[PDB]
Amino acid sequence: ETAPLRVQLIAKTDFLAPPDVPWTTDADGGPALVEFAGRACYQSWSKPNPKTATNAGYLRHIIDVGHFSVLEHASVSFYITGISRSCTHELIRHRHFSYSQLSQRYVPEKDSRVVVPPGMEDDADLRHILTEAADAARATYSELLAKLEAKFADQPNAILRRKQARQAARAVLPNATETRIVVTGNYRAWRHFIAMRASEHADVEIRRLAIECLRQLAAVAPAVFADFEVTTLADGTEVATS
Amino acid sequence: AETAPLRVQLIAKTDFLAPPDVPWTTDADGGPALVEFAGRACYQSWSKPNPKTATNAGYLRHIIDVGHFSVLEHASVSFYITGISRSCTHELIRHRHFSYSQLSQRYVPEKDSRVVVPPGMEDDADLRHILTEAADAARATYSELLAKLEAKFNAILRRKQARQAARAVLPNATETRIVVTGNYRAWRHFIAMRASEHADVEIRRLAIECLRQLAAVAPAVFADFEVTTLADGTEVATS
Amino acid sequence: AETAPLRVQLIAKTDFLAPPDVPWTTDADGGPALVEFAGRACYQSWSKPNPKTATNAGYLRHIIDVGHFSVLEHASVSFYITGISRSCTHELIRHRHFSYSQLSQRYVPEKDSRVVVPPGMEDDADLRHILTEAADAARATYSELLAKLEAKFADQPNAILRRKQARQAARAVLPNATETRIVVTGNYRAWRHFIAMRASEHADVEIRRLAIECLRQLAAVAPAVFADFEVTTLADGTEVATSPLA
Amino acid sequence: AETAPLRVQLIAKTDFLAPPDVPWTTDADGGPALVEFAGRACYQSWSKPNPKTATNAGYLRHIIDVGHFSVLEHASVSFYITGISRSCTHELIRHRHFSYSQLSQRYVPEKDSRVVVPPGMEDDADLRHILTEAADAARATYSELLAKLEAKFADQPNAILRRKQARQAARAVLPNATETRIVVTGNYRAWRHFIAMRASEHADVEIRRLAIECLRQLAAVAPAVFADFEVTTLADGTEVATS
Ligand SMILES: Cc1cc2nc3c(=O)[nH]c(=O)nc-3n(C[C@H](O)[C@H](O)[C@H](O)COP(=O)(O)OP(=O)(O)OC[C@H]3O[C@@H](n4cnc5c(N)ncnc54)[C@H](O)[C@@H]3O)c2cc1C
Ligand SMILES: Cc1cc2nc3c(=O)[nH]c(=O)nc-3n(C[C@H](O)[C@H](O)[C@H](O)COP(=O)(O)OP(=O)(O)OC[C@H]3O[C@@H](n4cnc5c(N)ncnc54)[C@H](O)[C@@H]3O)c2cc1C
Ligand SMILES: Cc1cc2nc3c(=O)[nH]c(=O)nc-3n(C[C@H](O)[C@H](O)[C@H](O)COP(=O)(O)OP(=O)(O)OC[C@H]3O[C@@H](n4cnc5c(N)ncnc54)[C@H](O)[C@@H]3O)c2cc1C
Ligand SMILES: Cc1cc2nc3c(=O)[nH]c(=O)nc-3n(C[C@H](O)[C@H](O)[C@H](O)COP(=O)(O)OP(=O)(O)OC[C@H]3O[C@@H](n4cnc5c(N)ncnc54)[C@H](O)[C@@H]3O)c2cc1C
Ligand SMILES: O=c1[nH]c(=O)n([C@@H]2C[C@H](O)[C@@H](COP(=O)(O)O)O2)cc1F
Ligand SMILES: O=c1[nH]c(=O)n([C@H]2C[C@H](O)[C@@H](COP(=O)(O)O)O2)cc1F
Ligand SMILES: O=c1[nH]c(=O)n([C@H]2C[C@H](O)[C@@H](COP(=O)(O)O)O2)cc1F
Ligand SMILES: O=c1[nH]c(=O)n([C@H]2C[C@H](O)[C@@H](COP(=O)(O)O)O2)cc1F
């Protein structure tokens, strides 16, 4: 069974303006918070600059002048499914995110799905080769699992027994095995992720993820992600540059 | 000298949106619900297989009891804090898993700045008088230097170049103001480290107040901290 | 078909030179001396009133007991680690206060890659065989995919990207047990936290083995800094390290 | 009234020990050699098959050109910094990828504490005198509070924490210009970012002066890693660094 990439926005900043600060703005949530924090530095509550009088104008300005630390106050979480283990091994090299990921030590993978590398998505021959090799690996897994539980059948704690079995058995599961992950980042962390991974230099699977994250973040905070331009390459893949 | 009292205002928390095609719901909203979701994502335990942990409060109690603290990182809270001293912020910002935006003495004029009275001096008219007179002397000097530095030196940077030099004389007690954002794990660590007998009483008072507001927001996440009063009437928090 | 044994090689540590004007000397050099120097800098406490903290090992043991762990961050150690699996590195790199440089399957040839045997099946020749046969089939599949993918991306002019486009796709079939190699750098505090989390009975046996070996090499380069960790051998013969301060 | 000039002393750097059975060597030691080792581990490029990057300095210049800054994190330098003000350290420690150990006003008596002169008033004696007079006045208030606080905490039988309870309140009156002292440790990537942000005309002139001195000593340790930073003197005589 193959798994399609799915990205679902599950959390974002709720902003509660403090009543005794003489300031308002034409926005809500993370974008509003980011403006509040910017202004706290200068106590510029009355907005004496006409061209930064709207939220979008203030956020646009912040980025233009490169005051990126102000962006860190607002965050967004996604639940990402239909991503491979090779892709999460790349993703989690980003150290200014927080992660909760599906565990092969704890979750049975006998019926696990696989993710097709975008490079061979339209190639039926290559896909068939991939999927049959995946079925062979899953069969080896179930075979290893039985023998391993038998082998640890002097381990009185049955729960620990199965986990000892499962963590060794998963040695044969391929990189393409689907995983699922909650990723939380602040806006600065997201911008850095998109710059790095939505590039022609990046692997195509993570590039595809970065583009989809960008599209969804652009909706929550248009002015924070505006400078990114999405273009298509010769192969129909997209990159985002700023 | 006008004195500034500590004020802590909660200005941001988490909005949670359960994703439609995952067969799970919970009784909670916001940060605590997000934390449960992220913990269950690890085990894909979307049904309520275990009764003891089939409510949000039961689930988070488990998470904390068995030390799975990384899952707490997904939810955040922001405060706007005023009536805190410059020496207090110099300690606060040593915590590197928070994000900060702070009142800038290079930009903001301090001719009328307030001072924060150290908790140890608060109850004493003599001591407070000594501080406030010293503060007034320093503000006079600040303004003197500011005038001679503007004269010593474009118009905006002239002022800023002047202002960044002039603040050399502003005391540690000078009021500052700051936005602090942290995830639940970061806040837990801050409270454990700062709401303690080992900490300065100013940052201690700050940490207790943050704990009080956080526990109102997310009581299962902060339930293991007990507030105790010491002989000197200050408060500490232990887990 | 070829198996890779765990190997941990210490490749970098801290070199310390005391500032000559500071009226202080100590019992040690490198990292442990740096850490003492940093701790004394907070207090400007250059003199030595207490027999128990008047030696480097003594001062360091004191820092750890009173929980001033931020002082330990000034000294770092790097290892080059080989004979570690991809599933092991996927756990390892969740530690975010380390720096990593790791063998890239997007670039490096994997047709002859070695496999890492899970410790749980190390002594069972039949299980080793089920595993290595599977890895051989997977490497054959990788080579079959790559041949075709190379043709598909041949018209990409940049040599480095066209090799990555083919190989990044081919490695989809490589198993978790595939050998990787990684340079890991961290400061003493970061190493302490890793050991606490990974040299434990809750941890997977492969990363546990790695943690214990790092601990042993770290305790050798940095006396007193890791002394509160005590290695014990569980009943299955695997080793765990425990500390009452971590 | 004693003034303290900036001093930056390099106290630690990376010691590199190349691993026996990896078929590679290079024309450097220390942090620069380690950085090259880590970079080559990513591709197992041990034979050095590219002649243009076959020297250490060339490989390091390549890393930076290609933007693979993560590899620079493996090597570090530590400084002991004195003659820096409290306002300067309040800025410096906003950099969260450094480690710090700093002189504590909670624990260290400040009766004899020195003043750091802002670079802005350095060539104006009358301004310096206003500063140092205000410092002396603050320091006398500090001592006055300290005695009066040590008395007021007679309750406390523990003499150590009695004097710290005193000191932590008493330092309320100490000025921003109060000298502090700090050990700062960072890897090469963190140092590059610090220099980029602080050795610029946008930064306060004290921290800018600090960043320039660090850059000069770091360039001595790892020239190729810091070569793209070029010091310029602005019209006012201060120095900026730009890449
Ligand atoms: C037995 C075991 C089982 C595990 N099971 C799972 C699992 O099922 N699913 C899963 O996704 N992961 C799992 N993990 C991974 C685990 O949740 C951590 O990600 C990993 O162990 C890294 O350690 P750390 O979280 O302490 O953070 P590190 O990255 O090692 O950080 C060190 C310290 O810095 C602090 N810190 C770092 N970053 C932040 C931050 N952003 N905010 C606040 N504080 C921070 C914390 O104090 C932390 O202890 C498991 C780990 C173990 C040991
Ligand atoms: C009572 C008290 C006295 C103090 N006295 C002094 C003093 O005399 N001098 C002085 O300089 N400071 C002093 N400090 C500051 C102290 O050293 C810490 O910098 C500060 O409290 C931040 O807490 P933390 O060290 O846990 O790091 P945080 O920045 O709060 O990080 C949280 C967690 O992330 C992890 N982490 C973060 N960065 C790293 C890293 N670079 N490497 C490895 N792990 C990391 C650690 O697990 C850490 O616990 C004092 C603090 C207290 C509470
Ligand atoms: C001219 C100037 C004026 C300033 N004015 C103000 C002011 O008025 N008010 C104020 O509060 N501050 C001010 N600052 C401080 C500034 O906003 C930063 O806090 C400080 O310079 C630290 O640098 P940094 O933001 O690059 O982060 P560092 O902590 O130096 O981290 C380095 C890099 O790590 C990454 N990073 C670290 N932490 C995170 C995180 N939590 N999330 C995502 N990425 C992270 C970023 O990529 C960053 O570039 C000013 C700084 C300068 C240079
Ligand atoms: C095209 C491509 C190819 C790659 N190839 C390889 C490879 O062959 N081998 C390999 O091992 N990795 C490889 N990587 C991973 C890469 O080295 C980084 O680990 C990963 O992209 C995370 O990004 P980041 O390093 O910018 O830092 P993040 O962890 O995303 O941190 C964000 C920012 O915080 C700051 N920061 C975080 N931690 C530190 C720190 N410890 N010191 C100083 N600053 C810090 C930096 O400013 C950084 O930009 C590759 C990545 C890409 C995009
Ligand atoms: O003991 C564990 N350690 C670990 O780091 N994780 C991880 C890292 C990975 O990102 C994810 C799933 O890992 P695994 O397949 O090893 O369970 O959570 C999981 C565990 F169970
Ligand atoms: O309790 C303390 N908390 C703290 O954060 N520091 C830090 C912050 C600052 O970077 C330096 C000196 O702090 P202080 O003058 O408050 O002691 O060490 C020191 C303490 F003693
Ligand atoms: O584009 C890349 N992105 C990435 O994060 N790495 C990392 C992640 C992993 O820790 C290791 C090897 O990754 P991979 O097999 O995907 O090349 O280096 C490597 C790349 F080439
Ligand atoms: O150039 C600056 N650099 C800096 O780090 N800050 C910080 C540090 C401090 O936490 C707060 C105010 O610093 P200052 O009073 O120097 O403006 O924001 C502010 C600037 F203007």
Task: Give which of C132, C168, C178, C236 to mutate to test A binding, by max A Cβ within 10 Å.
Answer: C168
Looking at domain A1-12+75-121+174-242, does it have CATH number 3.30.70.3180? Answer: yes
Report residue A40 as tokens: 């706290």
Let me know: does A187 contact A221? Beta carbons within 8 Å: yes
**C119 Cβ contact list (under 8 Å, min separation 6):** A168, C205, C206, C209, C238
b/e A173-189 (16+ beta carbons within 10 angstroms → b): bbbbbbbbbbbbbbbbb
**B109 Cβ contact list (under 8 Å, min separation 6):** B163
Mutate to test the pocket of ligand 1, among A83, A85, A103 (most ligand atoms within 8 A of CB): A103
Is A86 near ligand 7, meaning CB less than 6 Å away? Answer: yes
Quick check: C183 contacting D, CB < 8 Å?
Answer: yes
Q: Which residue, among A155, A148, A116, has the nearest Cα to A132 in the 3D structure?
A: A116
Distance (Å, rounded) from C-alpha B173 to C-alpha A22?
25
Burial status of residue B144 (CB atoms within 10 A of its CB: 0-12, 13-18, 19 or more): middle
Q: Which residue, among A188, D182, A76, has the nearest Cα to B101 in the 3D structure?
A: A188
Distance (Å, rounded) from C-alpha B137 to C-alpha D204?
25
Total number of residues shown for chain D: 243
Quick check: D47 contacting C, CB < 8 Å?
Answer: no
Report residue C123 as tokens: 């002594």
**What 3-state DSSP class applies to B7?**
strand
Closest ligand by atom to C71 CA: 2
* Cα torsion angle, D169, D170, D172, D175, sign: negative
Distance (Å, rounded) from C-alpha C118 to C-alpha C86?
11
Distance (Å, rounded) from C-alpha B139 to C-alpha B110?
8
Residue with tokens 């980025």: A63
The CATH code belonging to domain B123-170 is: 6.10.140.440
> Are residues D149 and B138, on separate chains, in Cβ contact within 8 Å?
no
**What is the 3 state secondary structure string of chain C?**
CCECCCEEEEEEEEEECCCCCCCCCCCCCHHHHHHHHHHHHHHCCCCCCCHHHCCHHHHHHHHHHCCCHHHHHHCEEEEEEEEEEHHHHHHHCCCCCCEEEECCCCCCCCCCCCECCCHHHCCCHHHHHHHHHHHHHHHHHHHHHHHHHHHHCCCCCCHHHHHHHHHHHHHHHCECCEEEEEEEEEEHHHHHHHHHHHCCCCCCHHHHHHHHHHHHHHHHHCCCCCCCCEEEECCCCCEEEECCCC
Q: Rounded to the nearest 10 degrees, how much is the dihedral formed by the CA atoms of D115, D119, D120, D124?
A: 70
Dihedrals phi, psi of A70, to nearest 5 degrees: -65, -30
Report residue A118 as tokens: 């975008």
**What 3-state DSSP class applies to D12?**
strand
Q: Which residue, among A91, A42, A48, has the nearest Cα to A189 in the 3D structure?
A: A91
Distance (Å, rounded) from C-alpha A167 to C-alpha A137?
15
* Cα torsion angle, A188, A192, A198, A203, sign: negative
Residues of chain D with CATH 6.10.140.450: 14-75
**A158 Cβ contact list (under 8 Å, min separation 6):** none
Dihedrals phi, psi of D136, to nearest 5 degrees: -60, -40
- Technique behind the model: X-ray
Quick check: A10 contacting C, CB < 8 Å?
Answer: no
Dihedrals phi, psi of C131, to nearest 5 degrees: -60, -55
Q: HSE (CB half, 13 Å, CA atoms) of A115?
A: 28
Quick check: C233 contacting D, CB < 8 Å?
Answer: no
Give the bridge partners for C16, in sequence order: D12
Let me know: does D138 contact B171? Beta carbons within 8 Å: yes
> Are residues B43 and A11, on separate chains, in Cβ contact within 8 Å?
no
Q: HSE (CB half, 13 Å, CA atoms) of D91?
A: 20
Total number of residues shown for chain C: 246
Residue with tokens 């360039």: D219
The CATH code belonging to domain C1-13+76-122+175-246 is: 3.30.70.3180
Let me know: does B64 contact B185? Beta carbons within 8 Å: no
Distance (Å, rounded) from C-alpha D143 to C-alpha A159?
65
Annotated active-site residue A197? The verdict is yes
Distance (Å, rounded) from C-alpha C205 to C-alpha C208?
5
| Residue B4 DSSP label | -
**What 3-state DSSP class applies to D40?**
helix
Residues of chain B with CATH 3.30.70.3180: 1-13+76-122+171-239
Report residue D99 as tokens: 């480690």
> Are residues D94 and B93, on separate chains, in Cβ contact within 8 Å?
yes
- Tally DSSP H helices, then E strands, for chain D: 8, 6
Residues of chain D with CATH 3.30.70.3180: 1-13+76-122+175-243
List C residues 105-164 in contact with A (Cβ-Cβ < 8 A).
Answer: 105-106, 115-121, 124, 126-127, 130-131, 134-135, 137-138, 141, 144-145, 148-149, 152-153, 161, 164
Catalytic residue among A138, A197, A207, A208, which?
Answer: A197
Measured CA distances, D240 to A190, B164, D123, D219, D229 (Å): 31, 18, 19, 15, 10
Q: HSE (CB half, 13 Å, CA atoms) of C65?
A: 10
Taking each helix axis from N to C end, the angle separating B125-152 and D125-152, rounded to the nearest 10 degrees, works out to: 170
Measured CA distances, B124 to B117, B119, D138 (Å): 10, 10, 20
Measured CA distances, A226 to A230, B13, C98 (Å): 10, 25, 33
Pairs of residues, one from chain A and one from chain C, whose beta carbons lie less than 8 Å apart: 136
Task: Give the E-state strand segments of chain B in sequence order.
Answer: 7-16, 76-85, 98-102, 175-183, 226-229, 235-238
Distance (Å, rounded) from C-alpha C87 to C-alpha C203?
13
Measured CA distances, D138 to B120, B136, C241, D115, D129 (Å): 19, 11, 52, 11, 14
Quick check: D85 contacting B, CB < 8 Å?
Answer: yes
Q: Which CATH class is domain B1-13+76-122+171-239?
A: alpha beta
| H or E stretch at D79 | strand D76-85
Distance (Å, rounded) from C-alpha A209 to C-alpha A95?
17
Domain covering D123-174: architecture: Helix non-globular (6.10)
Quick check: C96 contacting A, CB < 8 Å?
Answer: yes
Pairs of residues, one from chain A and one from chain B, whose beta carbons lie less than 8 Å apart: 125
Looking at domain D1-13+76-122+175-243, does it have CATH number 3.30.70.3180? Answer: yes
Dmax (CA) for chain D in angstroms is: 75
| Residue B52 DSSP label | G
Let me know: does B26 contact B43? Beta carbons within 8 Å: no
**C88 Cβ contact list (under 8 Å, min separation 6):** C116, C180, C204, C206, C207, C210
Q: Please name the residue ranges forming H helices in D67-221.
A: 86-92, 125-152, 159-170, 188-198, 205-221
Q: Residue A124, Cβ neighbours under 10 Å: how many?
A: 8
Task: Give which of B7, B8, B10, B15 to mutate to test A binding, by max A Cβ within 10 Å.
Answer: B15
How far does Cα B76 stand from its chain's mean position? 12
A10: chain B residues, CB-CB within 8 Å: 16-19, 34, 37
Q: Resolution, rounded to a tenth of an Å?
A: 1.9
For chain A, give the DSSP string.
Answer: -B---EEEEEEEEEE---TTS----S--HHHHHHHHHHHHHHT-TT---GGG-SHHHHHHHHHHTT-GGGGGG-EEEEEEEEEEHHHHHHHTT-TTEEEEE--TTTS--TT--B---GGGTT-HHHHHHHHHHHHHHHHHHHHHHHHHHHHTTT-S-HHHHHHHHHHHHGGGSBTTBEEEEEEEEEHHHHHHHHHHHSSTTS-HHHHHHHHHHHHHHHHH-GGGSTT-EEEE-TTS-EEEE-
**What 3-state DSSP class applies to D141?**
helix
Helix, strand, coil shares of chain D as percentages rounded to 5? 50, 20, 35
Let me know: does B208 contact B192? Beta carbons within 8 Å: no
Q: What angle do CA D38, D42, D46 make, to 5 degrees?
A: 75
For A154-182, give the DSSP string.
Answer: T-S-HHHHHHHHHHHHGGGSBTTBEEEEE
Let me know: does A26 contact A54? Beta carbons within 8 Å: yes
Dihedrals phi, psi of D160, to nearest 5 degrees: -70, -60
Strands B175-183 and B98-102: antiparallel
Sheet holding C179-187, edge to edge: C99-102, C179-187, C76-85, C7-16, D7-16, D76-85, D179-187, D99-102
Q: What angle do CA B95, B99, B105 make, to 5 degrees?
A: 90
CATH of A13-74, one of 3.40.50.2300, 2.30.40.10, 6.10.140.450, 3.90.950.20: 6.10.140.450
Residues of chain A with CATH 6.10.140.450: 13-74
Let me know: does A225 contact A214? Beta carbons within 8 Å: yes
Looking at residue C44, its amino acid is Q
Q: Which residue, among D204, D207, D206, D196, has the nearest Cα to D241 in the 3D structure?
A: D196
Q: Residue A110, Cβ neighbours under 10 Å: how many?
A: 10
Taking each helix axis from N to C end, the angle separating B30-43 and B56-65, rounded to the nearest 10 degrees, works out to: 70
| Residue B38 DSSP label | H
CATH of B14-75, one of 2.160.20.10, 1.20.1370.20, 3.40.1410.10, 6.10.140.450: 6.10.140.450
Let me know: does A147 contact C127? Beta carbons within 8 Å: yes
CATH of A122-173, one of 6.10.140.440, 3.40.50.2300, 3.10.580.10, 3.40.50.170: 6.10.140.440
Distance (Å, rounded) from C-alpha C125 to C-alpha A204?
39
D30: chain C residues, CB-CB within 8 Å: 15
Distance (Å, rounded) from C-alpha A62 to C-alpha A101?
33
Task: Looking at the complex, report in whole angstroms how far the Cα of residue B102 sits from the nearest Cα belonging to chain A.
Answer: 5
**A64 Cβ contact list (under 8 Å, min separation 6):** none
Residues of chain B with CATH 6.10.140.440: 123-170
Is C97 near ligand 2, meaning CB less than 6 Å away? Answer: yes
**What is the 3 state secondary structure string of C124-140?**
CHHHHHHHHHHHHHHHH
Distance (Å, rounded) from C-alpha B219 to C-alpha A34?
27
**D206 Cβ contact list (under 8 Å, min separation 6):** D84, D85, D87, D88, D116, D118, D119
Distance (Å, rounded) from C-alpha B7 to C-alpha C145?
64
Looking at residue C132, its amino acid is T
Distance (Å, rounded) from C-alpha C188 to C-alpha C181?
22
**A144 Cβ contact list (under 8 Å, min separation 6):** A168, A169, A171, A172, C121, C127, C130, C131
Chain breaks after residues in chain B, where C lies over 2.5 Å from next N:
153
